[PDB]
């Protein structure tokens, strides 16, 4: 979904906690 929030949230909780 083009919500951007889910994408940014998953992105942050992806590289930060990589």
């Amino acid at each position: 979904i083009p919500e951007s929030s889910e994408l940014t949230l998953q992105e942050l909780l992806g590289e930060e906690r990589r």
Side-chain angles (χ1 to χ4, degrees):
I1 25 71
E3 310 310 300
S4 79
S5 178
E6 291 288 355
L7 288 72
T8 46
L9 178 67
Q10 183 169 58
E11 171 183 1
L12 299 174
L13 279 74
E15 289 197 1
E16 292 177 355
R17 301 174 182 287
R18 197 275 164 277

